[PDB]
């Protein structure tokens, strides 16, 4: 009167095997779609970091009139600025990992990834330089 | 003014260091704050993206408009985008778990948000495989 557990599980297994067969037969299409999306996300990531770096670069030389404010207050402002920037030093590291992995996989946008990375590393190294320049040139 | 503007940069520089460890605690306090801010902004972004996905994974189920070939194409793009973004939650785990391992002040909030993120990501995957199977009927 009752159906065996084995029969019930086998019915589910057959549904899964059919589903897996269909994904396997369309592996190439699936690969290309995922590759396109991975690049889209990577570009989104690069743009987010880039927009931020430029914002902090504008600041690292802006609001610079003469500074009738306590040397102490200006000091701790720069220390706050330095803390923010240090807090975000992980962003560029993650871009590298992402971009380099696709590069190592022969992703179709390798060359665009390559130049995008050196351009962000350049803007990043710049920000760290102008941050130091501002740091010592207030003690002088 | 030459001597005046030299007393200032000497008085501050004098108090600027009285014990290095206290200075270390201070900027550690500042870094922890911004590190937390970045995590929160990233978590809400992934949270928002995941919910948009769960919703899409159920608009029209068995309708007439699109044919089987078209619906299957749309579903494969859906799975593709989701898998393409599976690194999003990995990076948050790394960032959030590092703060927890340090004794960061918002540890509880962070631990709790990571848990809920994984739960929702897991059922996005689940629902996704359900929709896929349903299309083979």
Describe this structure in words.
Two copies of one chain form a homodimer. The first copy, chain A, has helices spanning 5-25, 27-59, 71-87, 90-104, 110-136. By secondary structure, chain A is mainly alpha-helical. Chain A has a single domain (1-140), classed as Methane Monooxygenase Hydroxylase, Chain G, domain 1 (Up-down Bundle), CATH 1.20.58. In chain A, helix 4 packs antiparallel against helix 5 (110-136). Chain A is elongated. The N and C termini of chain A lie far apart (92 Å). Chain A binds chain B through residues 15, 18-19, 22, 26, 29-30, 33-38, 40-41, 71-72, 75, 79-80, 82-84, 86-88, 90, 94, 98, 139-140, and chain B through 8-9, 12-13, 15-16, 26-27, 30-31, 33-35, 37-38, 76-77, 79-81, 83-85, 87-88, 91, 95, 129, 132-133, 136.
Brief overview:
The structure is a homodimer. Chain A has 140 residues and is mainly alpha-helical.
Which features would summarize this protein structure in a list?
actin binding, structural protein; mainly alpha; homodimer; 5 helices; Methane Monooxygenase Hydroxylase, Chain G, domain 1; 140 residues
